[PDB]
């Protein structure tokens, strides 16, 4: 299976600089042209920039948005593509693609994506509080709050409960983001059985684990 | 540089349905024509290359016609798992131009919101802060109202609103709404209430506890 997995993203100031790394597995990497699609949240996806193979001299285009501030690149030696990013602003803020081009100039595999977000709001680790209910099936809740920047990633019980779940998208206060998630599971379920809220901030290097209690 | 013109913008089908989908180039783009669909959360996929030829492992369903300048995306028998964004996209010429998307939206019958509310946690108010939340969860259609009141008056500020996208299975939405105060502010009065307005009731559903 085609792989591509993106990294480097994070916050940075505007004026600051972030290079991005995508590792290519499951195919040629040296029979195919390359590149780099951001998309920021309810927007169409923006391309960036094209790197072509040896043939044509790792040649490269670049959208107008980018061009003379991002440089793409590639290392056959380890099959990765790269992309620096200098003077980048707040509306650099979007999810970063490292994107195949296939056969018929196609953009064919797409990877997970890696987030960047260009702010001058500083990094804070999310205060994580678990919702307790004041017949039939229970709700319960967590309440991320306090932190910058997104995304943390929220599960239950450490992934094994995934039924029953809405985790709503984070929202921005005053440079902070809040975010919610409800889990729904038979009245039989809980509080005999634990249900744990985890929440991953990696901008903070944290994880925190909330057990809901009666 | 080509621009991609996509039409409707946001359509809502029911279940079962036939489909149709337009992209449009502003110069000609040959055969050189994608289409992706982006599930809620999910990233772009492959459906359709070379105008029409189908991506391996995409249901037949879909389906791809145009050459030139004007492009149309059928998809047969609508199904829940189709809710998502399509995107066109011309390989043409550089730079690589997308369409602005068309958001599928499925249509279904009314569903009232069930609807939970939290007192602040232990935890938050040893830090000092007081939110109460509601959750007002697998409703239909998504149009829906929350208001706030503190011993029976309206409370606007403080007041911090997140929706669902559409859900891939039920085809229902949810919302979450997080009214934060000072602890000492919360401490001051006794009534906590959400309540929704929504198609389902001809009156707000309310919930609500007393500190
Ligand atoms: N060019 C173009 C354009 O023009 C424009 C521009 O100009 C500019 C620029 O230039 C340039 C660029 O563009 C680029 O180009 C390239 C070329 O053209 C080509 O190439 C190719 C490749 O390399 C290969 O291919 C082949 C194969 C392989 O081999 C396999 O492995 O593959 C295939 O098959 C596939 O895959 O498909 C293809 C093939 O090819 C062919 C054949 O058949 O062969 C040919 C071609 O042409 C075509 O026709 C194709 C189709 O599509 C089909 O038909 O086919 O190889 C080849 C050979 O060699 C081999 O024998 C070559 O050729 P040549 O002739 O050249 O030699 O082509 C490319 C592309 O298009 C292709 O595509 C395809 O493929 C891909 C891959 O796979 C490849 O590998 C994929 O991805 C896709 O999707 C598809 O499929 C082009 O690119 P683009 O980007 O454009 O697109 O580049 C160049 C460089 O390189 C060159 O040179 C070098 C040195 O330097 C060397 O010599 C090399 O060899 C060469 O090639 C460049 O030059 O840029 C420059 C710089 O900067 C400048 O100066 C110029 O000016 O632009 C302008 C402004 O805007 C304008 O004016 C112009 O016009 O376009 C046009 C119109 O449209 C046209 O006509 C032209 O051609």
């Known amino acids: 299976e085609v792989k591509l997995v993106e990294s480097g993203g994070g916050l940075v100031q505007p004026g600051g600089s972030l290079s991005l790394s995508c590792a290519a597995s499951g195919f040629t990497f040296s029979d195919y042209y390359m590149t780099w699609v951001r998309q920021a949240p309810g927007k169409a996806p923006e391309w960036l920039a094209l790197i072509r193979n040896k043939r044509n001299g790792d040649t490269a285009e670049y959208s107008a948005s980018v061009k003379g501030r991002f440089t793409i690149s590639r290392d056959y030696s380890r099959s990765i593509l790269h992309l620096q990013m200098n003077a980048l602003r707040t509306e650099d803020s979007a999810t970063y693609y490292c994107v195949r081009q296939g056969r018929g100039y196609t953009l064919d595999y797409w990877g997970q994506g890696t987030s960047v977000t260009v702010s001058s709001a500083k990094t804070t680790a999310p205060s994580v509080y678990p919702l307790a209910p004041v017949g039939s099936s229970v709700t319960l809740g967590c309440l991320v709050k306090g932190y910058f920047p997104e995304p943390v990633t929220l599960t239950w019980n450490s992934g094994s409960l995934s039924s029953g779940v809405h985790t709503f998208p984070a929202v921005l206060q005053s440079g902070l983001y809040t975010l919610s998630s409800s889990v729904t599971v038979t009245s039989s379920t809980w509080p005999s059985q634990s249900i744990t809220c985890n929440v991953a901030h990696p901008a903070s290097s944290t994880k925190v684990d909330k057990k809901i209690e009666p | 540089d080509i621009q991609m013109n996509q039409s409707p913008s946001s359509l809502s089908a029911s279940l079962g349905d036939t489909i149709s989908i337009t992209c449009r180039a502003s110069?000609?783009?040959?055969?050189?024509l994608s289409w992706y669909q982006q599930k809620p959360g999910n990233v772009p996929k492959l459906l359709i290359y070379?105008?029409?030829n189908l991506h391996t492992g995409v249901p037949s369903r879909f389906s791809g016609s145009g050459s030139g300048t004007d492009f149309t995306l059928i998809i047969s028998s609508l199904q829940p798992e189709d809710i998502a964004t399509y995107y066109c996209?011309?390989?043409?010429?550089?730079?690589?131009?997308f369409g602005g998307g068309t958001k599928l939206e499925i249509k279904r019958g009314d569903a009232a919101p069930t609807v939970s509310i939290f007192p602040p946690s232990s935890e938050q108010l040893t830090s000092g802060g007081a939110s109460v939340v509601c959750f007002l969860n697998n409703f239909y259609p998504k149009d829906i109202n929350v208001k706030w009141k503190i011993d029976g008056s309206e409370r606007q500020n403080g007041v911090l609103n997140s929706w669902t996208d559409q859900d891939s299975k039920d085809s229902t939405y949810s919302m979450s709404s997080t009214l934060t105060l000072t602890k000492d502010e919360y401490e001051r009065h006794n009534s906590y209430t959400c309540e929704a307005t929504h198609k389902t009731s001809t009156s707000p559903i309310v919930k609500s506890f007393n500190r």
């Open positions: 070379k105008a029409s």
């Open positions: 996209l011309q390989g043409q010429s550089y730079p690589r131009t």
């Open positions: 110069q000609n783009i040959n055969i050189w």
